[PDB]
């Protein structure tokens, strides 16, 4: 059975759960981000907390699509994880059988195509708060294999009315449907303590995105209004409609027309419509950019060039440690969810026996940090000449040099 | 059969699929970018999401043509990949037969002309979200060969009404036509999780492009209006049409005419039409430039000179790591699509047997990063004198020095 203990029946693995819900596949996103206002966004968040995740997911998709800075930051964060080397390792002080099972799973994963896409789809849970991937199973003789990984939009799910922390499909029923065991991979990173609805990172970044959007739109309109000054023409009583239309045409053309003539009984005035500066909008956009960068990557230097020195070394150290521990946390969570959702079904479906869930293999990402080889090379001789016995295994491990074989 | 398992029939390889659709070849792009407004662009995106990819593809082509900064950034990104060395490597722990097949495919690819053009055409999927290249096959005796690679405009395809993730040709039918197996190379890089329509990078960059376009056009008009001030002439009652035309001519000429005379009963006033500055437009254009650079290359220094020091080292490290992992991701995706679409048909059509799809050869790009030879040279002697056995293979591999033969 799965790690959660739910009974597992192999009959349902032959067909995807969503196959019987063809209505979902034909849905088109409604794009709630267009014409968004603070009241509407607050309503969206409140209704999402009560189990209406569709609008929130669509809004998050639009938000990630429409913002270039948030796009770049999220892409950087995800590509940081995508570049890490991974391996499968048996349980602690494992035996020969457990070692063989771990090696077999490692072999299975190394050639498993689409793994990079699987990781990319799973990492969307950092922003959306949860990512669901459906597994398609097939039989190549006596062994079960995941034929393909299909990421499903977050708009397809909701919350259980009796459980705020449990996700369900949308099957036109108030209670939804429970997720099929051995049929989904669910990644739910925990940046904050709380329920699934409130756990998405995009919930924090929603407000700065709206601030930037409003500032940029207002700046664009103000750019549209500069240049020609607004001017108003006056006519005396007894002017006819033909002459008034002529005056309107003349006044409209005066902006691009260098000269014009009117009767002394008429008047036209110029007003300097805009008479403004863009500095407020720029400042607000910079504030939003800095907030988003700090929230996503934990720092701001990585996105913008620092125009100062002296403290650049301490800033670099802080940034490097923040990036390192953020990456470590994300990779550990991703490895945990992968080991929970993918490795266990393979182990229990392809290999004989019923191994304890306690001794199941765990996926591990390579979080080794490059060490300065020169410093170690110069330090070792003095220590060894003193008399200290430094194990060769530790030196190999820190330096990344593989053991002789 | 292909990697996707679809039955493959060699009869259809003799003619291109599009050959029977001569109407497509005669089509001319409609250039939707001219006279573009935010409402029109939003409509274009919305209709593209529903399966109307023609307008979106034409808009993306116009956008890449009309913007010099986006042009340069995309060219830099693609030429980064074009310069990487590549080789074909057999499956893991391969046998003699698999090694021979991989070597034969390597030989076939090395002399295969047009490979650089094939990579260039495939890399357009980064911006457009998908690039389709049609294969022309021929028989030189007993072996099949790709005679030529023909890139087709993205405006020729659409989405399956019953599948938002499946592409089809435009054959004047509502459902289109399914892509012929063994006849196309499809590259669909995945920057974000989502459907094919929303996966294009240009969708993110569309808005900053429009912002820059509007700012530059308004700045150009404002430049046109500076200089001569707008002036308005007045005449008293009883002025004749000849005299009014004369007054209009005089007022029009006063800008470039240093002097003029009019009756004391007439008046002319000067207004200082523009009385403005270009700073708002410059600031908006800089914002758009920075956004595009960050979205494309992950940084801004590579496109503009940094006017500060101190932190230049940390900024350079961040930029180098961002470029490295971005290039690695792009190259890995390109190699995956190439191995899926080009290597497998050659293996199954030119060589005997039916090798497992699991053991198929995979194209690999050279992602080795140059290591400082001096540091390694100075570090090795101390480590070896301590007693550590560092394999010569690892040193050769990191330093790029080939094995002795």
Author numbering:
A (entry chain A), B (entry chain A): 5 to 409
From the paper:
Bacteriophage Casadabanvirus JBD30, from the order Caudoviricetes, is a temperate phage that infects the bacterium Pseudomonas aeruginosa. The virion of bacteriophage JBD30 is composed of an icosahedral capsid, long flexible non-contractile tail, and a baseplate.
The JBD30 portal protein (gp32) has the same domain organization as portals of other dsDNA phages, such as T4, SPP1, and T7. It is composed of crown, wing, stem, and clip domains. The diameter of the portal channel at its narrowest is 30 Å in a virion and 21 Å in an empty JBD30 particle. The difference is caused by the conformational change of helices α12 from the wing domains and tunnel loops of the portal proteins.
